Swiss-Prot record:
Signal peptide: none
Family indicated by similarity: Belongs to the KEAP1 family.
Taxonomy, superkingdom: Eukaryota
Reported impact of residue 92 to M: Impaired interaction with NFE2L2/NRF2
Site (Sensor for electrophilic agents): 111
Organism annotation: Mus musculus (Mouse)
GO molecular function: disordered domain specific binding; identical protein binding; RNA polymerase II-specific DNA-binding transcription factor binding; transcription regulator inhibitor activity; ubiquitin-like ligase-substrate adaptor activity
Name under which the protein is recorded: Kelch-like ECH-associated protein 1
Taxonomy of the source species: Eukaryota, Metazoa, Chordata, Craniata, Vertebrata
Originating gene: Keap1
Kelch repeats: 4-49, 50-100, 101-147, 148-194, 196-241, 242-288
Residues with the S-cGMP-cysteine modification: 111
Disruption of the gene: reported phenotype: Early postnatal lethality caused by abnormal cornification. Mice survive until weaning and probably die from malnutrition resulting from hyperkeratosis in the esophagus and forestomach that cause gastric obstruction. Defects are caused by constitutive activation Nfe2l2/Nrf2, leading to constitutive expression of phase 2 detoxifying enzymes. Mice lacking both Nfe2l2/Nrf2 and Keap1 reverse the hyperkeratosis phenotype and are healthy and viable in normal conditions.
Length: 290
């Protein structure tokens, strides 16, 4: 359910199919069952000890193709299993989980930028569209806090976004929440305690290192200790009350750089480095493969 940091897919010269797990308890990396198709700018989530890869795109030399797929990886069997496909392909996707259901936010398909949202029901192996986001959003940040889905930043088609909105599943509607202090396309969005962190990204001109959090109670975005490196198209996850950023693009290189955020000590620290440097990775935390 939650023990190893899994890094699914990514990109470096082409869309990677790598599935490496990191043990923060001994700094080790474990290469596992490669993804059936390589994918990049996909989402990674965990539902009931099972790891899911949602969306992305296969930027290959033989031709680039956005994904509608939702694969499943099992730490016990160390196997990938193709599950029910989402109505649409969604590259630079956003995913969150509310009450054991995967929500698939925005993402792009060819020139189209999606405003749409779809909900996977693992018990039935079905995908059903729900009300769409108020804005079209790619490279969107998605986080669930208090059984509410939040879509942070992204790119509408014309503008890079600082805006964010919340989804209330019962009413099946989206309302805008306080906008960020910074414009963030290709952010790294997660939830730690009661705050929603939006780290790095691209403000239209440069890769960001700034990390700002949204406090739900107070409804205000606030800056915190910046990251060591500037990153857009980065991996983010929370493990044992510490935010972990994974790779991404700095403006010059596709980083191998993995940083941990101690919110208690308000500090970012170089924790390891992924085998290969890469961007657009899918990242989730679940049980070891034993
Ligand atoms: C540098 C770069 C160039 C190429 C050719 C590709 C293919 C990749 S990628 O695989 O990682 N995909 C992604 C490219 C660009 C992204 N955002 C970030 C900022 C950028 C913008 O508004 O300018 C759009 C992404 C966001 C989330 C996930 C994957 C993203 C990368 C990062």
């Amino acid at each position: 359910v939650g023990r190893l940091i899994y890094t699914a897919g990514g990109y470096f010269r082409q869309s990677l199919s790598y599935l490496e797990a990191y043990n923060p308890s001994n700094g080790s990396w474990l290469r596992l069952a490669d993804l059936q198709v390589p994918r990049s700018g996909l989402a990674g989530c965990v539902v009931g000890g099972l790891l899911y890869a949602v969306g992305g795109r296969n930027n290959s030399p033989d031709g680039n193709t956005d994904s509608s797929a939702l694969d499943c990886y099992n730490p016990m069997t160390n196997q990938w299993s193709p599950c029910a496909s989402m109505s649409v392909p969604r590259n630079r996707i956003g995913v969150g989980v509310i009450d054991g259901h995967i929500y698939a936010v925005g993402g792009s398909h060819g020139c189209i930028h999606h405003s749409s949202v779809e909900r996977y029901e693992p018990e039935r192996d079905e995908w059903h569209l729900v009300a769409p986001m108020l804005t079209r959003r790619i490279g969107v940040g998605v986080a669930v806090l208090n059984r509410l889905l939040y879509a942070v930043g992204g790119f509408d088609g014309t503008n890079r976004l600082n805006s964010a909105e919340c989804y209330y599943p019962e009413r099946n509607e989206w309302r805008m929440i306080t906008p960020m202090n910074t414009i963030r396309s290709g952010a790294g969005v997660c939830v730690l305690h009661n705050c929603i962190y939006a780290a790095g990204g691209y403000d239209g001109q440069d890769q960001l290192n700034s990390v700002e959090r949204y406090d739900v109670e107070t409804e205000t975005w606030t800056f915190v200790a910046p990251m060591r490196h500037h990153r857009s198209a980065l991996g983010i996850t929370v493990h044992q009350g510490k935010i972990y950023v994974l790779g991404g693009y700095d403006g010059h290189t596709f980083l191998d750089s993995v940083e941990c955020y101690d919110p208690d000590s308000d500090t970012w620290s170089e924790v390891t480095r992924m085998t290969s440097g890469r961007s657009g990775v899918g990242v989730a935390v679940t049980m070891e493969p034993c």
